[PDB]
Amino acid sequence: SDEVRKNLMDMFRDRQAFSEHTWKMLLSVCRSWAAWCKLNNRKWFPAEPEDVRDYLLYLQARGLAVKTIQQHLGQLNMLHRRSGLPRPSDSNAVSLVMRRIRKENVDAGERAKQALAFERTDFDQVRSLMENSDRCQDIRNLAFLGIAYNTLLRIAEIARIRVKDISRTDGGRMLIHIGRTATLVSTAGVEKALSLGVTKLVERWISVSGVADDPNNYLFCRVRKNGVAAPSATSQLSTRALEGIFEATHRLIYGAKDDSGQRYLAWSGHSARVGAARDMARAGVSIPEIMQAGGWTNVNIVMNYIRNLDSETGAMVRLLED
Amino acid sequence: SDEVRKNLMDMFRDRQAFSEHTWKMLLSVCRSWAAWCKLNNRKWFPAEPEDVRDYLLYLQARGLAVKTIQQHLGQLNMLHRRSGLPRPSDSNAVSLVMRRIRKENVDAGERAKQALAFERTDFDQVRSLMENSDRCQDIRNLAFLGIAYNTLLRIAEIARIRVKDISRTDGGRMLIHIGRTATLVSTAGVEKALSLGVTKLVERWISVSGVADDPNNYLFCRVRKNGVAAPSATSQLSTRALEGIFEATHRLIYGAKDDSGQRYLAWSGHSARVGAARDMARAGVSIPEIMQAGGWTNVNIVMNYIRNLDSETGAMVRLLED
Amino acid sequence: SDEVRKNLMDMFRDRQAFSEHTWKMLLSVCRSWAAWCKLNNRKWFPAEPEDVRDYLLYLQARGLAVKTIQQHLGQLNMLHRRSGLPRPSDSNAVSLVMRRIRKENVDAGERAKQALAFERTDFDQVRSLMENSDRCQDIRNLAFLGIAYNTLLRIAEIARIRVKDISRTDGGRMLIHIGRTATLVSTAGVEKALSLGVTKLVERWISVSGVADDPNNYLFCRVRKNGVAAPSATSQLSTRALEGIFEATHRLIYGAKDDSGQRYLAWSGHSARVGAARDMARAGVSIPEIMQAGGWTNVNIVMNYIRNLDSETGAMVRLLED
Amino acid sequence: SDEVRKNLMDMFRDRQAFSEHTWKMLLSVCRSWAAWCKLNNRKWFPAEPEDVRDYLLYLQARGLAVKTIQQHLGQLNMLHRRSGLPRPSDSNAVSLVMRRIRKENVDAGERAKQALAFERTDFDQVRSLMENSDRCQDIRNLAFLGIAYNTLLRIAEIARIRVKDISRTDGGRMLIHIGRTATLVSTAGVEKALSLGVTKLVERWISVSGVADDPNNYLFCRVRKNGVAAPSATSQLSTRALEGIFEATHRLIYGAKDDSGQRYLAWSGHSARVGAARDMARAGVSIPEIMQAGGWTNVNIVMNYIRNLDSETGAMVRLLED
DNA sequence: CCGCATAACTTCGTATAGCATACATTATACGAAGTTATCGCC
DNA sequence: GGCGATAACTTCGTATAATGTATGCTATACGAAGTTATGCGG
DNA sequence: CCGCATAACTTCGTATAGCATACATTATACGAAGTTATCGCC
DNA sequence: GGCGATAACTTCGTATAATGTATGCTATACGAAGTTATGCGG
Incomplete structure (x- = not known):
């Protein structure tokens, strides 16, 4: 017909x-x-x-x-x-x-499997090793990992942050306006803050890379074999390339991955969401604050994240071990 | 058909x-x-x-x-x-x-854009800059800004206040009765009290303007080129004229607008509601006690006015910074 | 057809x-x-x-x-x-x-109007007055008011409590099983707990009236002109009678009702619900706890209760006037 | 048709x-x-x-x-x-x-009814009474009660455990791999850990019986009239026989069961989950940890098990009993 | 032995407020064009 | 004696942010006419 | 001065998680017949 | 050295508590094969 x-x-x-x-x-x-x-x-x-x-x-x-x-x-x-x-x-x-x-x-x-976690003691160790770096590439990578852990953003959203969206509170802290997400679509959008720690990393990146020259530049750019950064206003650093930062960092800490042919043998783009949600729920934050931090709408989604908490240190073992 | x-x-x-x-x-x-x-x-x-x-x-x-x-x-x-x-x-x-x-x-x-705030430090400045004028137009304007900031009323509601609706309590504070409510269930209440400091300004206006000669007179009126008021029981200032008070007061302290043609380059009819809400949220006032004062019912707009205050950084900043 | x-x-x-x-x-x-x-x-x-x-x-x-x-x-x-x-x-x-x-x-x-509030200070005043009465009628009325203020139930549900419904915690507080309500109807249901002081009033009434020696009696009953109770398992006080208790208690303190013929000139069965809600709002209890205590489903109902508050003591006057 | x-x-x-x-x-x-x-x-x-x-x-x-x-x-x-x-x-x-x-x-x-709770005090009493016994059928029962209380597993999924699912950490605690999960997304996770005390029981059972002689044998099996155990790999102990352990151990302390014909006059398979839930709630473990521990996705059931604890008394009790 | 009359509730009718879920009106911002009651020269 | 100039406001049209009302049932508010037991002076 | 190398990133193709809303299927409880491997009394 | 009495379960049926899956779309995981600018022999 x-x-x-x-x-x-x-x-x-x-x-x-x-x-x-x-x-x-x-x-x-x-x-x-x-x-x-x-x-x-x-x-x-x-x-x-x-x-x-x-x-x-x-x-x-x-x-x-x-x-x-x-x-x-x-x-x-x-x-x-x-x-x-x-x-x-x-x-x-x-x-x-x-x-x-x-x-x-x-x-x-x-x-169903789940991504390998990336928790605060790992971030502290990575930062401890990398803090002395003077390479542009290490500055970019450490600033990215900081934003990823602090905001719980998806990689797809971090790839599209325009310089014009970076703004400051009355004090020192940074604010990022995100706009649309995997579910939200509005011009009001969501706005997220950064701690007095990671803003030094982001501001160092912006100062060294010179992306501030035009408000339409992206924050994240290619850094070539020579070490020069190539600012752009029309091309986005691919998610396939952003995953490589996690893989290269894990290899730096633990050495090479084996050929077993199974997923999640190393950190991947979802690792920081899981690790932050676990760290926050284990510290005893209330359900409404967890929900506002992550931005989910239904509380049971939290039970999908905290699934694999370590049973060998959970409540009942401590309770019976007196 | x-x-x-x-x-x-x-x-x-x-x-x-x-x-x-x-x-x-x-x-x-x-x-x-x-x-x-x-x-x-x-x-x-x-x-x-x-x-x-x-x-x-x-x-x-x-x-x-x-x-x-x-x-x-x-x-x-x-x-x-x-x-x-x-x-x-x-x-x-x-x-x-x-x-x-x-x-x-x-x-x-x-x-989305949002109105420019008018804040306590501005009210203090315009007051200390203007309160000594004998010129009747200045008394009229300084009284209007006081009622606007103290009551959070919308300008179309302020334009309708009959002098019949004013009363004066045993403590001396003025009470303004709400003549026509916005909604059949008046979530804002029915009566609003002015500060002792503002009351002196309104009494100065009422005594100078002679508007108290008849209960049906409207509290605010036009002032001719000659500098003389014209009481009326049958006509109101246009809201378009009231916006001129905010514009002229901003132009008195700063320069003038850019040629950029954008909105919200100067104070406007909502500038008071935003500024008062931000002042209340900067103090210790609880969310429902804020929300009842302005007559809001959804959380969303109250959040949208305070999101960039450093009280609202949330659980992750609290964990990271200590 | x-x-x-x-x-x-x-x-x-x-x-x-x-x-x-x-x-x-x-x-x-x-x-x-x-x-x-x-x-x-x-x-x-x-x-x-x-x-x-x-x-x-x-x-x-x-x-x-x-x-x-x-x-x-x-x-x-x-x-x-x-x-x-x-x-x-x-x-x-x-x-x-x-x-x-x-x-x-x-x-x-x-x-739309609203009922006259019955707040904490009135309850303390009534307890100070009536605590020493030997009339079982006064013991009944003071127990009823204490429950109604504590539990926020509708008087139609307070009329429905069986002696079966009453239990104690190991701390000696009393728990009332509600069951059916105006909106929730299930064989599992809400259970609500009294403070110690109100339990002492309730146990005093139970001991005096003897209603509790048969489990299927209702908790509240009429008392004859002679001052003797009449337990029953097949009949219960009208809500009209419970409204009479509020009106009589108001007339006890303030002496007489006005002749104006307006509605809500004196306390009525809804008065306690409004009062406790206002006391919670002034106390700064968070919205999720107010929602749980009242049992309401949607946050808008909170704003439907605190419609009226004393503007002359409100946050804006308290802030502007130091 | x-x-x-x-x-x-x-x-x-x-x-x-x-x-x-x-x-x-x-x-x-x-x-x-x-x-x-x-x-x-x-x-x-x-x-x-x-x-x-x-x-x-x-x-x-x-x-x-x-x-x-x-x-x-x-x-x-x-x-x-x-x-x-x-x-x-x-x-x-x-x-x-x-x-x-x-x-x-x-x-x-x-x-609606609930299971009779089997709490920590009962487990300590039963252990202190039975643990001296040497006949195989008693050791079996005590090991079963220890596993049921420590893991919160249901009786049916307890019957499925094959001896190859047991393994040991260098901390000397024993881990149990779940095998067949209840659901594709296993809210309870994948592995459970025993305390040292319960491990001391299980090691005794698994060494007195022959069950360990084949990794395919089921962990629990019939014991005949003369105390000979009958290990098996094709057939598993019926759930009806598992309920008999709870009923018989209750009867051993409280004597003959009443004749009223009601349900839940004695412990049953759910008594452990309710007991361990209340025992955790008394210790102030936050709701997300309790829910992840037992595998509940809906908070209403956890709430229905803990309402009776006075820790759950609402804000109006805090306001009255200030 | 008696009739009476006060308490303390019950039944009835006409007005008005409360709830939970689903989706459309209602107001302000700004530039430009018109008033019409007073300053001014000459 | 006027013609003219000009503050301070009113009316119009298009662009954008804010707050609302309809459904389908559940309750309470008030006063007037009734009912059943005791207290009191015969 | 030219050609060859190799960091660092793009496209492309099959395979598996995550979400928000709406609506049923899955398990335990407990009488009471029925089974079979042994003691017990000659 | 035969018969029957007993655990210690197993199978069955009906009554009541508890936890689940379907839908429509959006995103991540990984191997592999191009691209394209710089580094440097000679």
Whole structure:
């Protein structure tokens, strides 16, 4: 019917309305689905539920994780719903098979992993080693780690701080205005403070790098092999490069990583969120202050962060050890 | 369709259902929508989503703020709903457009602005600079600034104070009765007391102006070129004239505005509410005792006025600094 | 047509799902509407929108409060909705006339009233006066006032306490299990705790009256002219009687009621709820604790209580006047 | 209809989508419903609102709790949903009678119960009494009580522990790996640690029995009439036998159980979780640590276990008892 | 033995306030164009 | 004796920040007409 | 003076976490039949 | 050297307390293969 292609044309015409990341994986899963359908001589676009059942079981037999299969189903649902057709997931066969896979894989022992923490005694050790550095690169790296630990920002947000957003309170402390986030979108935005410690690091960076020459410059820039910094107003330092600061620092402290082929063997971009949330909850701050520090809306999100507190030093052990 | 004719007759029959400030805006929107439709040969009254798309993109290209565009769409919704026709915002296209617009403009870095504060040190300065004038206009202005800062009333509420509404308690403080409340549940209360210091200024005005000859007189009035007051029971100073008091007082101490054309280069009708709130929050006053004084009910705006005070640095700064 | 008869028969057959106050008010509204329709020779049940427009304009000319007219419309809406017919309020002709009446009456200065507060100093004064009375009537009244001030319950819930509901902590405080409330209804529920002093008053009353020797008696009961209690398990004090206790206690201190015929000239059953809330607000208790103590769901209700406070002692005068 | 036959066949094809505990209840509910429909001579499968109403009122006359009645309605709604029919809960009359039953039965004084708490004093007493014993069946029971109290694990997940899940730290404490988690995101984490004292018990049990001779053996097993232990790897000790340990040890101190026929007259499987919760609350451990320790995501349950402690008395008690 | 009359509550009706959740009006900011009641020269 | 100049304010239109009202039920406020037990002087 | 090297960062492709709102499935409690490995009394 | 009496559990059914998953979208993790400016043999 024409209305399907009309709706698809409308969805593509305002492609900017979705995230940059949401389009990438719609296409990625569409490749795999169409390839499997062709290999088995089945019509690929208007999916038939008894074929989707076979596809899901085939994905299970390959050994993919449950959240991968959740993604693979979720995009086909999105595509049909936005086309204006009934979802595949409305039929009982796929609805029950998804539960069956979840049950059997969880009973076999699969679980969700979590990033390796980065706690205050690590920040103190890194700072103790790096404080004497006169390299521009070390100044940049230490200032970044300071902002990351203090604000609990995402890496994607730290990549886009304009110089014009840096402002000062009545005293010495710095204030950063963040604007939109992964959830908030408004011109009122959120504003966050920095301690009398890390502002010396940020102000040293700004003074040495000279990014202050134009209010449209970004704070963070490429530093080349020569050691010169290349200020810019039109290109952002990639998140793929920001992860390398964490990896290089962990290698500096503990030496080289092994080839085991498992995730989270070293610090990664999420490590500072976890470590700050653990340090703050262990110190006994109240739930409302934790919520205001992190900016979450639902209190149970806190229980997703503090999951892996060290049982060998928790409340009951101290209580029974008298 | 004569049913629309009926619905319109039954709408403007009860036109007093809406503020005159609403009617002022609805016609200003319709003039622009009709002019654009005329220029582009579109049919103007029953809006088509493929027209509303193009019009919203034209407003974006003209550079209006996001909330101006939301105002423009809101009035078109109101006109359709009261006409009985399907609400244009319900269409799939225009919601995708609005999402694209706001996400683009927020990525361009638009930020909300806020009134310049008028603070205790300024009230002390203007007082010690002006209180010796015999010129009646100076007495009138110095009394107005005192009532404004002491009561946090909005200027449209201050313009309506009858001299009938003043009373004088046994301790000598003036009590101002609130004639017309803003809301059926008057969250601000019903009566406000002036300081002893301000009372002397208001008594100076009442004695000089002769306005106490009749209870129905308005407390504030125009002063002619001759330097003589003109009491009235039937007319009020325009709020436009009251804004001139703030402008002239700022111009008296500082220079003049830049040619930059930006808003909030000088004190304005909300400068007192902001400044008083910041003074209260800098002292020890509790959040609900602040919130009750100004008549707010949402936390958000009270936070938005105090966010940059060094009381509000939060739990992480407290942990880091000790 | 006659399916309406089935719908109404179902609504009547299960009517115990609704509070009896909701039926009592509905029948009075129907008597009013039917009497007016009979006076003007109109058909009464299916509410033609222009008829209810005439009826609302007739009510406004009697000078009834805005809340009364809202109630009169709200019951006719509910009667149509539950019958399975289009609401009369769905017409623009009715909702605009309501919006007009609301906005016009506020220009005449109408506002919602509030009960007279009963604060801590009054409680201490009454205890100082009555503590030594040997009349069991005084022991009862002083226990009732102590509970009502401590626990912030509605008097309709204080009338409902069984002797089964009373327990003690190991510290000797008393706990009252509330169960049902005006908004929360479950077999688990709220439990509230008295201070030591109020427990001494309650135990004094229990010991004197003997009500506690059978667990299913109610805690409060009538006392005859002779000064002897009459325990019961099947009847309880009217709320009218509990209001009489407040009014008599006010007349004990201030001697006589004014002849002016205004409402809220003396303490009434709501007086204690308002007073404790004000005492908490002046004490600087945080919003989450005030919310927990009152049991309210949403922060706006806090602002709905502290509407009235003494401006002549308020923060702004206290700050400006040193 | 063939659609029903196919939907039922699909529901049977994937039967592992639900726990066996869901199937058991669905069958008991269907037997009850079909028996009642047979006795009253009505068609039973395509259930009708009048029949569900009559059945619900029949269940109320047996005096079943309101949560049992809601369970009975729930399973019939599941059966209808998965059969692909409209469901009784969406109907009008069922929604009214569920209100009627709830409100009437709450006003009748129906009350929710809790487990009898097994607190630190009881564990110290039982240990001081039993620990001298040398017969294997006593050592088993004391080791089980120690693990249950220290870990807060539930009895079912305690039965699953294979001996290869035990491991030892260089601190001499014993760690238990959870194995199968309850949920994909394990709020309780992944590993539990025993205190030294409980480890001294477990080492005795694991050395007196032969269980350690194969890493696949279950940690607990039958002990026969002559004290011979019967280690196994295919079969695990039934939960019913685990409840017997709590009941028998209670009976050993407090004698014969009362005849009143109520629940919770003696300790049961939850007595340890409630006891350890209250023991932590007395020590002032903050709510986030208690919630992470026991794995609760909803604060309401932790609150319902600690209301009775006077530490939870509200701010009005602090204001009165200043 | 008696009739009476004061306490201390109960029942009834017409007015008015409270709650929790879901989504649209209502006011101020600024530049430009018009008043019309007094300073001034000549 | 006027014509002219000019303070101090009023009215208009487009741009942007702030605060509100509708639903669907639950309560309380007041006074007037009633009811059932004892105290008192016969 | 030219060519070759190598720090330091971009694109690209499959794989797994995080969120905020809305609505049911999963486990323990406890009578009471039923099983089987042994003592007990000849 | 045979029969029956006892633990010490196991399986079953119905009644009541407690914790869970689905949806729609946004982000991070990691290996691999380009890019492009400086360093420096000779």
